[PDB]
C-alpha cells in the first residue's frame, strides 16, 4: 500500500 | 484567450523550478506524480492525484444595492493527497477546497526535517469570464472548504 504523511 | 487561465509555476523556493499552465478549457485540472494529472510534478511524497484545481460558477446569495460577482466563474483548489498541501497560510487536508486568487502560492509538500520544500505560484493570465479573476473576498477571510462526492467523482475518472 501507499502510506504518505508529513510531520 | 490563448487556452490558459491559471498558471501554477513551481518557483525556485520549491525543489522544482518549472511552470505549469492550467488550461481554462480543462476542468478540473489535476496535479500529481502521475502523468494522468493535467499537471506533472514528480515528488516522492506527492501522490498520483495529489491535488487538482476545479473552476466553478461564482454566485452570491443576493445583491442588495451593491452589485456582487453577479454570476461569473472562480477557480477552486482541491487537494486529494494524503500528505496534505498548504495554501499560503491555510491547511489543505485530503478532500479540501480553497479559493485561488491571482497570485496564489500553494505548497504541495513541506518537510521541516526532510527539508523537502514545495510550492507553486498561481498566476491568472487569462480571465475566462472571471468576476474579477481571483481576489478571494467574503465574510470569511481565506477559509478552507471540504470536498464532496461531486469532487471525488471528478478525480474518479482520472
Contacts of B82 in chain A (CB under 8 A): 2-5
CB contact B17 to A (< 8 Å):
no
User: Taking CA atoms, what residue in A is nearest to B93?
Assistant: A5
Distance CA B89, CA B103 (A): 14
CB contact B109 to A (< 8 Å):
yes
Distance CA B40, CA B46 (A): 11
Contact B79, B72 (CB under 8 A): no
Helix-strand-coil percent breakdown of chain A, rounded to 5? 0, 0, 100
CB contact under 8 A, B47 and A4: yes
CB contact under 8 A, A4 and B82: yes
Residue B138 lies in domain: 1-158
Distance from CA of B32 to the nearest CA of A (A): 13
Report the number of distinct structural domains present in chain B: 1
- Give Cβ neighbours of residue B138 (< 8 Å, ≥ 6 apart): none
- Give Cβ neighbours of residue B93 (< 8 Å, ≥ 6 apart): B79, B84, B144
CB contact under 8 A, A3 and B82: yes
- For residue B65, how many other CB atoms are within 10 A of its CB? 4
Distance (Å) of CA B120 to CA B40, B67, B140: 12, 33, 23
B144 in helix, strand or coil?
Answer: coil
- Give the determination technique: NMR
Contacts of B81 in chain A (CB under 8 A): 4
Distance (Å) of CA A7 to CA B41, B67, B110, B115, B128: 21, 44, 9, 12, 38
Contact B53, B73 (CB under 8 A): no
B157 in helix, strand or coil?
Answer: coil
CB contact B24 to A (< 8 Å):
no
Q: Return residues 58-97 of B near A (CB < 8 Å).
A: 81-84
Please report where in the chains the cell 469570464 appears, as a residue: B129
How does DSSP classify residue B91? E
Q: What CATH number corresponds to the domain at position B155?
A: 2.60.200.20
Please report where in the chains the cell 492525484 appears, as a residue: B49
Option in B81, B110, B114 nearest A4 (CB): B81
Amino acid at each position: 500500500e501507499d502510506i504518505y504523511y508529513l510531520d | 484567450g490563448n487556452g490558459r487561465f491559471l498558471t501554477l509555476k513551481p518557483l525556485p523556493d520549491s525543489i522544482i523550478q518549472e511552470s505549469l499552465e492550467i488550461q481554462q478549457g480543462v476542468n478540473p485540472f489535476f496535479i500529481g506524480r502521475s502523468e494522468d494529472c493535467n499537471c506533472k510534478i514528480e515528488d516522492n511524497r506527492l501522490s498520483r492525484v495529489h491535488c487538482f484545481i476545479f473552476k466553478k460558477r461564482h454566485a452570491v446569495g443576493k445583491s442588495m444595492y451593491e452589485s456582487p460577482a453577479q454570476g461569473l466563474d472562480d477557480i477552486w483548489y482541491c487537494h486529494t493527497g494524503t500528505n496534505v498541501s498548504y495554501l499560503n497560510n491555510n491547511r489543505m487536508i485530503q478532500g479540501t477546497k480553497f479559493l485561488l486568487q491571482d497570485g496564489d502560492e500553494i505548497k504541495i509538500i513541506w518537510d521541516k526535517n526532510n527539508k523537502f520544500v514545495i510550492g507553486f505560484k498561481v498566476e491568472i493570465n487569462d480571465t475566462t469570464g472571471l468576476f474579477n479573476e481571483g481576489l478571494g473576498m467574503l465574510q470569511e477571510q481565506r477559509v478552507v472548504l471540504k470536498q464532496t462526492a461531486e469532487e471525488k467523482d471528478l478525480v474518479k475518472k482520472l
